[PDB]
Amino acid sequence: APVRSLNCTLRDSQQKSLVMSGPYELKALHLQGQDMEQQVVFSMSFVQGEESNDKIPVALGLKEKNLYLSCVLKDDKPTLQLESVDPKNYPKKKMEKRFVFNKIEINNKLEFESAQFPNWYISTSQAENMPVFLGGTKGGQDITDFTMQFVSS
Amino acid sequence: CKEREEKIILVSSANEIDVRPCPLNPNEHKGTITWYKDDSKTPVSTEQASRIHQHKEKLWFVPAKVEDSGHYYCVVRNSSYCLRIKISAKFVENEPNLCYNAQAIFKQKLPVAGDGGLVCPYMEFFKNENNELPKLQWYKDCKPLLLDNIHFSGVKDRLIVMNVAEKHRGNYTCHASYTYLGKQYPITRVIEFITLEENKPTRPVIVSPANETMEVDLGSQIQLICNVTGQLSDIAYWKWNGSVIDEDDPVLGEDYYSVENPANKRRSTLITVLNISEIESRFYKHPFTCFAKNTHGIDAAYIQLIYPVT
């Protein structure tokens, strides 16, 4: 394999899982013991960027859905968005900055800072069923901490 | 108008209040919101006192029964883009002897040997009591938990389980009492608590590029292999002369592999192959270093290429 990739699940620190809110958008909500298969499996690739040791650059894409979380400027504000790419060319170890997030692990607690837009992380609201977005205040009240579960089974 | 879906059915319990606002993505707008009955009827009442009714852009149930367990709608059309959202709710009765129905559990997990938090879902509406989430009472297997700050702590919508153990597994319930129109109704959520294995931090072990030298002919091609013994979330990569191997490099190229050890996953092997198509003059000056990395620190080991001995 040209790039190192692992399949994971992700749940925020408030225990909310993430799901598709209509292809091209994601949302976090707590799922009932029956709908647990509604959660998106990611393909976290270890892309090369600024390996700072306390950070590890990654690419987050929807499994076999050919979609990659990227960060772009939308209205002069850093924003999260899902964009499709070419399945043959992707995933690459040399990823364009927009799809690049630095995976920071504090107390077994994951944050994903945007390499493109530092001080802006993958966030979720305390609210149930709201979309997954890029948040800039970090601790404004919005959740920027997550947990990862590997799909080894 | 067109149509909108929403396949996830939220199963709330009958005998208590319940609200169901419509899922509005980035675009909401406050002047479009309206609910409808089963098989498209009229706007499910509009009086705060009636039972099944719509208030501040939300479909409240006052005491909610099992008969309410059905398909509802909501319509957004501010200017013209009408598509009317389908909901589909379900109300259940507590199973015999239990203080809950498993049809309504939310699966939540926490790793052993460390302080974690279980979260009482959908408390976002009942919050409004002057923007103060109600005082939650917690139970596991229908018995009450003492929130002493030794074994458990209750803060807002969460239950801090101190030093999670296998013995914390079970079905938990959080209880609140929401005052709606002077009359206070009850509220419960069940959480099936599943413990995860403790996450012990361990630096990976580079097995093969153990700081040595290798004789190579100046023209040929070779394969350098880095063998690491650690977890699968541990990575292994090459860097040569202070720099990573570029994907668009014409002579250097990596090939990554992993093999999980069935007997002990913390002792699985990462294999990273470096293919040098043509050994150049420069590769004899600086060594090819291999890095084993994870959040708890890196590991290094090199292979210094040298010309053969005459």
Neighbours of A96 (CB within 10 A): 13
3-class SS of residue A34: coil
CATH architecture group of domain A1-153: Trefoil (2.80)
Q: Are A43 and A62 in contact (CB under 8 A)?
A: yes
Going by their DSSP bridges, the two strands B90-92 and A121-123 should be labelled as unpaired
Residue of A8, A11, A15 to mutate when probing chain B, most B C-beta within 10 A: A15
Cα B175 to Cα B139: distance, rounded to the nearest angstrom: 8
Cβ distance A56 to B235 less than 8 Å, yes or no, reads: yes
Q: What are phi and psi of A67, to 5 degrees?
A: -140, 140
**B202: which strand partners?**
none
Cβ distance A131 to B124 less than 8 Å, yes or no, reads: no
Cα B202 to Cα B176: distance, rounded to the nearest angstrom: 42
Which residues, 6 or more positions from B146, have their beta carbon under 8 angstroms from its beta carbon? B152
Residue of A3, A4, A36, A145 to mutate when probing chain B, most B C-beta within 10 A: A4
Structure tokens at B83: 């598509």
Neighbours of A48 (CB within 10 A): 18
Which residues, 6 or more positions from A81, have their beta carbon under 8 angstroms from its beta carbon? A24, A69, A70, A71, A72, A74
What are the structural domains, with CATH classification, of chain B?
1-92 (2.60.40.10), 93-198 (2.60.40.10), 199-310 (2.60.40.10)
Cα B9 to Cα B7: distance, rounded to the nearest angstrom: 6
Which residues, 6 or more positions from A50, have their beta carbon under 8 angstroms from its beta carbon? A57, A102, A115
Question: Is B24 at the interface with chain A, CB within 8 A?
Answer: no
3-class SS of residue B281: helix
Residues 60-119 of A with CB under 8 A from B: 92-94, 105, 108
Residue B43 preceded by cis peptide, ω within 30: no
Structure tokens at B150: 């030794």
Nearest 5 degrees, angle CA B148-CA B149-CA B153? 95
Which residues in chain B touch residue A20, judged by CB atoms under 8 angstroms apart?
none
Chain B residue with minimum CA distance to A108:
B199
- Domain-by-domain residue ranges, chain A? 1-153
Burial of residue B290 (number of CB atoms within 10 Å: 0-12, 13-18, 19+): buried
Cβ distance B119 to A14 less than 8 Å, yes or no, reads: yes
Residues in chain A: 153
Q: Are B136 and B117 in contact (CB under 8 A)?
A: no
Residues in chain B: 310
Amino acid at A51: E
Q: Are A99 and A70 in contact (CB under 8 A)?
A: yes
The coordinates were experimentally obtained by X-ray
Which residues, 6 or more positions from B148, have their beta carbon under 8 angstroms from its beta carbon? none
Residues 193-212 of B with CB under 8 A from A: 199
Structure tokens at B75: 């319509």
3-class SS of residue A67: strand
Question: Is B108 at the interface with chain A, CB within 8 A?
Answer: yes
Picking from A144, A71, A139, the residue whose alpha carbon sits closest to that of residue A111 is A144
Resolution as reported, in Å: 2.5
Q: Are B272 and B288 in contact (CB under 8 A)?
A: no
Which residues, 6 or more positions from A131, have their beta carbon under 8 angstroms from its beta carbon? A21, A25, A26, A27, B25, B26
Cα A17 to Cα B118: distance, rounded to the nearest angstrom: 13
Please count the CA atoms within 13 angstroms of the CA of B208 that sit on its side-chain side: 17
Cβ distance B232 to A35 less than 8 Å, yes or no, reads: no
Interface size between A and B, measured as CB pairs under 8 A: 91
Cα A46 to Cα A23: distance, rounded to the nearest angstrom: 24
Place of tokens 């009086």: B47
Neighbours of B86 (CB within 10 A): 15
